[PDB]
Design a protein around this ligand. Structure first.
Ligand code: CHL
Ligand code: CHL
Ligand code: CLA
Ligand code: CLA
Ligand code: CLA
Ligand code: CLA
Ligand code: CLA
Ligand SMILES: CCCCCCCCCCCCCCCC(=O)OC[C@H](COP(=O)(O)OC[C@@H](O)CO)OC(=O)CCCCCCCCCCCCCCC
Ligand SMILES: CC(=C/C=C/C(C)=C/C=C/C=C(C)/C=C/C=C(\C)C=C=C1C(C)(C)C[C@H](O)C[C@@]1(C)O)/C=C/[C@@]12O[C@]1(C)C[C@@H](O)CC2(C)C
Ligand SMILES: CC1=C[C@H](O)CC(C)(C)[C@H]1/C=C/C(C)=C/C=C/C(C)=C/C=C/C=C(C)/C=C/C=C(C)/C=C/C1=C(C)C[C@H](O)CC1(C)C
Ligand SMILES: CC1=C[C@H](O)CC(C)(C)[C@H]1/C=C/C(C)=C/C=C/C(C)=C/C=C/C=C(C)/C=C/C=C(C)/C=C/C1=C(C)C[C@H](O)CC1(C)C
Lengths: 54, 236, 62, 34, 218, 194, 36, 218
């Protein structure tokens, strides 16, 4: 062609993902945030039936 | 729980207790029987003496109706899928043995098994064997032997107590020996019986109106649920 | 057969009028379930019989 | 443009994951309470 | 020939070999003393191996008779299609169903995962019931229940019941030894066992074992 | 006591909120409401049947419920013609009758029937804290919705057919033979950009 | 209307307005106790 | 504690004899009671089987993840020669040696007998050190040491480390069963395992396993 462009309009791809390089970033952020949260689970309230509602 | 839901005062009736008053029950029923829903809107059994023969008639009709509901379909259920058995329409099954009929087998076992036609030594054999069995159910001790199950007919019969539930040589495994398990199987027997009873009319009125195969009513109605109703058959 | 439909349909509509008028009154009266109980039973039974009769007769209407 | 696109997805998914794992992290007890 | 006590029929025989593996002197059916690898010195292990041998014998009788039957039916009078008991497992994919006894009037089944899903649930429930009871007679004997399992009652006399134990395990170990022969001449000749027997009744030794013995030269 | 202002603390314009601790009356409210929904679904359908003209296109008449039955494909032919009205009439009359049964059940629980089912019925009773019981009721609702979806699947696969609009020579009712159940295709649409 | 149900064409045309009157019925029912 | 004690989660639920085997009730992680063969009636035998099972588990995790990872990376965006763990070993012979990560500027390894020699030396070192105790840790516990190769220090509490024991064993048993699955799939289909997953997700009813059911016919 004349120029260079991604051509991502009208494709219909999941999460707008084109490269697998683009795809790994979702899990690479989600898993690390989940891991930080799962470490931070130590200083929270875990319980048998001590439920927070009426 | 097991006996409590189906006996006693607070058993399950045929209507909810918001439609009842829990005191308007006909007082001659009062539990102590399997299959007791407090159901008598007319009062055709108002004496407790009538209830005994009504129990007997109920149990006999149930035990015949189960075998009727099985055998009314199972050969037809083989033939409509393609068996070699002579015609499975139950209302015409009698007029096939008329002067030269045969049959087949493989209910549980294997084998295509024909029959050298015994019909005139079948009518009187039915009459004679039922004339044995029915008077035996009345009072008769009968012969003793030929080894079914356990016991193998030791002497003759019980000393009594069994107008409906003999169970001596009739348990080849000793099925009901605990009384609560016996009562559970009583409730299951009377329920399966009454459903077979209503099913017999369910076959019979279809044979009146439609005049088609009752097992074929499956393969017509489940295939086409708006091509086979009352509204497609009555109007025609 | 058309009149056989229509008389049953007018009867069904009038039974439904009887239900909508009386059955809330019988329910909301504080002893109405004790007093008018078999009347409600017979009314519901008659309503069901009229519905099934109209449904069967619509097959015979050609 | 792809160098920009990885960065935009990184920032967006970082803030959305911070949101979700914030609200899973014992929200209705950080009130004045009773 | 008593098969119990100190005078059970040793497997060797005339070389009866007194001073056996000395942790057994009869008292359980099948005991001859043949423990040469030495694996069951402990009593609990020995109980587990009685259990495992008994259950494998009682499965191996059915596994042998289910290979005896259909080729004899193909000899005498029936129709099967895939009559050989190896390819009989592939009768779901065969044409249009699985004709049990070759009659397309009964079951005529497809949907192999549906058949397997029925099989796994039923076998799991009946094996859990074999472990610890529930219905059908409470768990009373881990190997020899008999209560609901005697519709005839051959367990009446104790000496005859011990004789039936010994006949049971004698007639079990034979089936267990035969099934390994089924599995070996499965791979070696590929063909039916009654096919091999109908070859070997006619042919004494010209097709015996050794023509089918030059296979694994790489 | 029950239907009071100064004890329940709720005004007349917040009256439904007096049913938060009343399972039987709450059930009667819901079943009466379902009766209203089925009654509207019958009444507007029979209204459009009474005003329907078959020679005229269906969108020129201002009808909304009859196309929902014509899309399933009762009483239609090729090209979108209308051959019958009796399926539409049956679909009206069945709702119009079943609404009476649901209205009777709703009025019975909301007037005579017991307020708290947790006393004499340990199946139907429920406390808003009881998490296992709430998950039970949610499971029953999900099973009923699953059978509701399989009714549509069976109507497509075996019963008559569904009016496709992509058949050649104009739209036509056809029978689905191979429903494409590829997971990598079907879970595309849930993720595609809006 | 397809058939002999044709003379009910007046009372068909009253049906869909009926579900709206339940709101007014509830307002009149709560005015019957003079809103208390 | 639910996970071990007299009331652990047994290997059949209610059908677990309503009783354990009579020699193990808790006191060790991963105890469900599934010794039905009774192979570990003696306590030193049982200790040897734990000391073997834990090491097979800890190797099976790495053997899983190192099999999965190249069919992710090469099929996503990189080049590995061949990424399937059949032909992962044959990358030395292929064209110029084994380019690690497909890059002929890092390792670019050749000389397979030299790599074998380095493997034999270093694994002899670490498998002697694991038994006796050498540098970077004295031999104190043959299975759960808790020293300089546990830097983050999570085993300080008794109860949380007792739970993490069971987590390690559960993941270990799963990893072993999965690796057995990898090996049997490797025998049967001859394809990569993530390739098998992508082939199964396209048509689950016909590419199930039963298409590959007539391969080993005699
Ligand atoms: C005194 C003579 C006498 C002899 C020699 C035997 C022999 C045997 N008895 Mg015994 N018995 C004898 C007396 C009696 N037995 C019995 C009743 C029984 C029973 C019920 C049983 C035995 C069994 C045994 C076996 C025990 C060891 C074994 O398992 O061998 C197996 C190992 C070998 C035979 C060695 C293998 C050599 C073989 C020829 C090699 C084949 C060469 C191939 C060409 C090479 C293959 C190449 C590769 C690539 C495949 C052995 C064959 C047991 C048995 O049947 O085990 C199988 C058994 O269950 N006996 C009675 C009745 C009371 C006896 C009374 O006289
Ligand atoms: C009460 C119902 C219940 C049933 C039926 C089972 C069933 C089973 N659980 Mg169990 N569980 C159950 C409750 C529970 N389990 C567990 C947690 C566990 C664990 C952690 C484990 C089990 C395991 C087992 C197995 C134990 C026996 C065995 O090894 O199989 C042996 C029998 C078979 C394998 C037969 C399978 C039949 C199948 C149709 C064979 C296929 C035939 C092929 C065609 C053959 C191929 C031919 C050849 C030529 C290639 C068994 C399959 C063990 C297991 O599954 O390991 C693998 C195991 O590790 N369960 C919990 C949580 C506490 C339960 C709670 O209710
Ligand atoms: C989902 C709503 C619902 C729920 C939870 C209940 C629950 C209850 N009802 Mg009830 N009822 C309902 C709807 C409901 N009803 C409807 C619609 C009607 C009108 C017919 C009634 C009429 C009714 C009466 C007249 C009485 C009760 C009573 C009772 C209570 C005890 C007895 C009982 O259940 O037997 C009732 C059993 C039945 C009505 C049998 C139902 C018939 C089959 C099972 C229906 C199958 C249809 C199936 C689910 C498909 C759905 C149809 C459609 C939506 C697709 C119980 C709390 C009694 C009570 O208050 O005692 C204290 C009582 O006297 N009910
Ligand atoms: C729905 C089937 C059904 C069930 C549950 C029962 C249940 C019972 N029957 Mg029974 N019966 C039935 C059908 C059934 N009957 C029919 C059709 C006949 C006529 C052939 C009989 C003839 C019969 C006799 C002659 C006797 C019983 C007896 C009994 C009782 C104990 C035996 C038992 O556990 O059988 C349980 C049966 C089953 C679980 C069915 C097995 C599945 C079938 C074979 C398929 C128990 C109440 C005995 C009794 O009460 O005496 C103490 C007794 O003497 N029944
Ligand atoms: C469709 C919506 C709806 C529904 C289902 C309900 C239902 C209910 N409300 Mg309610 N409400 C509504 C809208 C609704 N309301 C609106 C819009 C308002 C604001 C004005 C209120 C304001 C309000 C207040 C202030 C209170 C309620 C209360 C109640 C409950 C008891 C009613 C009572 O005493 O019955 C008895 C009813 C009567 C004596 C009147 C007779 C009514 C009859 C039954 C009408 C039936 C007609 C129909 C054609 C019958 C069909 C029968 C069939 C067989 C054909 C009941 C469950 C009360 C409560 O909490 O209960 C303790 C309460 O305090 N409501
Ligand atoms: C669909 C589900 C649903 C349900 C089950 C409820 C249930 C409830 N809401 Mg609620 N709500 C909903 C949707 C819902 N709401 C929506 C969508 C809104 C946003 C508008 C609200 C806004 C809302 C407020 C602001 C409040 C509630 C309150 C309540 C509680 C008592 C209601 C009551 O008795 O009022 C009785 C009903 C009336 C007085 C009806 C008045 C009629 C309205 C104002 C206009 C009707 C317009 C109508 C379509 C016009 C038709 C044409 C006309 C010419 C006839 C009750 C738990 C109240 C409460 O105390 O909660 C604890 C409260 O303060 N809700
Ligand atoms: C290297 C294999 C190995 C070994 C030695 C052990 C060792 C042990 N396991 Mg164990 N286990 C393993 C793998 C192994 N496990 C796997 C893969 C699983 C998952 C299915 C389990 C699941 C498991 C449970 C659920 C339980 C045990 C228990 C036990 C202990 C007592 C049982 C015993 O004596 O086992 C002796 C085992 C062997 C000598 C292994 C023999 C290996 C040969 C090759 C035969 C195996 C063939 C195989 C069955 C064929 C199918 C393979 C396929 C199913 C994978 C013992 C420490 C019990 C316990 O208390 O845990 C500590 C217990 O309840 N195991
Ligand atoms: C096209 C298909 C689209 C699919 C979209 C999928 C969306 C997934 C949404 C997941 C929502 C999870 C909800 C929170 C779940 C939650 O509540 O966490 C908490 C839960 C454990 O809770 P507990 O604290 O009770 O654990 C028990 C003990 O800790 C009690 O003390 O952890 C999980 O179960 C995670 C489940 C898998 C979650 C996914 C795996 C996460 C790791 C994968 C990342 C890999 C890292 C790679 C590094 C490069
Ligand atoms: C409904 C039904 C009833 C059967 C009743 C029978 C069998 C009565 C037998 C009835 C048999 C009877 C009474 C036997 C009688 C034997 C007699 C008198 C002989 C004898 C002796 C002597 C000489 C040794 C002397 C001794 O001292 C006494 C005595 C008595 O021992 C069967 C139905 C089905 O069989 C069909 C019709 C078709 C199948 O497909 C489906 C099923 C269901 C199987
Ligand atoms: C004693 C001793 C002692 C010393 O010390 C040491 C030693 C020597 C080591 C020892 C010995 C041992 C031995 C001999 C063993 C063997 C075993 C076996 C062979 C088993 C089998 C076993 C076998 C078996 C069970 C089998 C089974 C089978 C079956 C079920 C079958 C099934 C089937 C059938 C129906 C047919 C179809 O077509 C298919 C199928 C489905 C497949
Ligand atoms: C318990 C019991 C009890 C009773 O009583 C009896 C019985 C039954 C006997 C028992 C059981 C048992 C069992 C089940 C077992 C199993 C095991 C296993 C399978 C293991 C594995 C195991 C497995 C394993 C380790 C694995 C490992 C692996 C590995 C390293 C790998 C490696 C690799 C990789 C990375 C990749 C590359 O490229 C190459 C290679 C080199 C290839």
């Amino acid at each position: 062609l004349v120029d260079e462009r991604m051509n991502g309009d009208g494709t219909g791809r999941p999460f707008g993902v084109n490269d697998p390089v683009l795809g790994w970033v979702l899990l690479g952020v989600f898993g690390t945030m989940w891991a930080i949260w799962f470490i931070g689970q130590k200083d929270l309230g875990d319980f048998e039936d001590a439920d927070d509602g009426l | 729980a097991d006996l409590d839901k189906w006996y006693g005062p607070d058993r399950k009736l045929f209507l909810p207790s918001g439609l009842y008053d829990r005191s308007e029950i006909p007082e001659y029923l009062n539990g102590e029987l399997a299959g007791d829903y407090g159901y008598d809107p007319l009062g055709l059994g108002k004496d407790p003496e009538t209830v005994a023969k009504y129990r007997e008639n109920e149990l006999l009709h149930a035990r015949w109706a189960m075998l009727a509901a099985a055998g009314i379909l199972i050969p037809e259920g083989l033939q409509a899928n393609g068996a070699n058995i002579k015609g499975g329409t139950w209302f015409e099954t009698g007029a096939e043995m008329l002067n030269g009929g045969t049959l087949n087998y493989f209910a549980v076992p294997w084998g295509i098994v024909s029959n050298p036609l015994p019909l005139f030594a079948v009518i009187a054999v039915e009459v004679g064997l039922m004339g044995a069995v029915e008077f035996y159910r009345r009072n008769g001790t009968g012969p003793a032997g030929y080894s079914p199950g356990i016991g193998k007919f030791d002497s003759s019969v019980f000393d009594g107590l069994d107008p409906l539930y003999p169970g001596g040589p009739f348990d080849p495994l000793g099925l009901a020996d605990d009384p609560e398990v016996l009562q559970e199987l009583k409730v299951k027997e009377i329920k399966n019986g009454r459903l077979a009873m209503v099913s017999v009319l369910g076959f019979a009125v279809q044979s009146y109106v439609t005049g088609e195969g009752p097992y074929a009513n499956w393969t017509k109605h489940v295939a086409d649920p708006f091509g086979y109703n009352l509204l497609t058959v009555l109007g025609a | 057969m058309t009149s056989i439909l229509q008389v049953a349909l007018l009867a069904l509509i009038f039974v439904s009028f009887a239900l909508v008028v009386g059955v809330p009154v019988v329910f909301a009266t504080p002893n109405g379930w004790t007093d008018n109980k078999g009347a409600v039973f017979s009314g519901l039974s008659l309503w069901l019989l009229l519905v099934f009769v109209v449904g069967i007769l619509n097959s015979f209407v050609v | 443009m792809l160098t920009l696109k990885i960065f935009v997805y990184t920032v967006v998914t970082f803030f959305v994951c911070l949101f979700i794992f914030g609200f899973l992290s014992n929200d209705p007890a950080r009130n004045p309470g009773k | 020939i008593e098969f119990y006590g100190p005078n059970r029929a040793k497997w060797l025989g005339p070389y009866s070999e007194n001073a056996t593996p000395a942790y057994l002197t009869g008292e359980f059916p099948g005991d001859y003393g043949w423990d040469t690898a030495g694996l069951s010195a402990d009593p609990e292990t020995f109980k587990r191996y009685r259990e495992l041998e008994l259950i494998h014998a009682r499965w191996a009788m059915l596994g042998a008779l289910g290979c005896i039957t259909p080729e004899l039916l193909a000899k005498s009078g029936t129709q099967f299609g895939e009559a050989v008991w190896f390819k009989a497992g592939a009768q779901i994919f065969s044409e249009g169903g699985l004709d049990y006894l070759g009659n397309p009037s009964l079951v005529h089944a497809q949907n192999i995962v549906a058949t397997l899903a029925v099989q796994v649930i039923l076998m799991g429930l009946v094996e859990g019931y074999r472990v610890n009871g529930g219905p059908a007679g409470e768990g009373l004997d881990p190997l020899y229940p008999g209560e609901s399992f005697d519709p005839l009652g051959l367990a009446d006399d104790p000496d005859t019941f011990a004789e039936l134990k010994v006949k049971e395990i004698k007639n079990g170990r034979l089936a267990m030894f035969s099934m390994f022969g089924f599995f070996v001449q499965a791979i070696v000749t590929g063909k039916g066992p009654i096919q091999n027997l109908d070859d070997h009744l006619s042919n004494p030794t010209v097709n015996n074992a050794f023509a089918f013995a030059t296979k694994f030269t790489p | 006591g029950g239907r009071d202002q100064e004890t329940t603390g709720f005004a007349w314009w917040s009256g439904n909120a007096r049913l938060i601790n009343l399972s039987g009356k709450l059930l009667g409210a819901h079943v009466a409401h379902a009766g209203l929904i089925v009654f509207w679904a019958g009444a507007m359908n029979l209204f459009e049947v009474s005003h329907f003209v078959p020679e005229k296109p269906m969108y020129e008449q201002g009808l909304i419920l009859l196309p929902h039955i014509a899309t399933l494909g009762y009483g239609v032919g090729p090209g979108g013609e209308i051959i019958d009205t009796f399926p539409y009439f049956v679909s009206g009359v069945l709702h119009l009758i079943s609404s009476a049964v649901l209205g009777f059940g709703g009025v019975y629980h909301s007037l005579i029937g017991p307020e708290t089912l947790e006393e004499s019925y340990p199946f139907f009773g429920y406390v808003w804290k009881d998490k296992n019981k709430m998950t039970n009721i949610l499971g029953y609702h999900l099973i009923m919705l699953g059978l509701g979806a399989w009714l549509l699947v069976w109507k497509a696969m075996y019963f008559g057919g569904v009016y496709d609009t992509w058949a050649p020579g104009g739209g036509d009712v056809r029978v689905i033979t191979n429903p494409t159940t590829n997971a990598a295709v079907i879970f595309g649409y849930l993720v595609k950009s809006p | 209307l397809p058939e002999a149900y044709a003379p009910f064409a007046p009372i068909v045309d009253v049906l869909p307005v009926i579900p709206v009157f339940f709101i007014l019925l509830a307002f009149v029912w709560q005015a019957a106790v003079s809103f208390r």
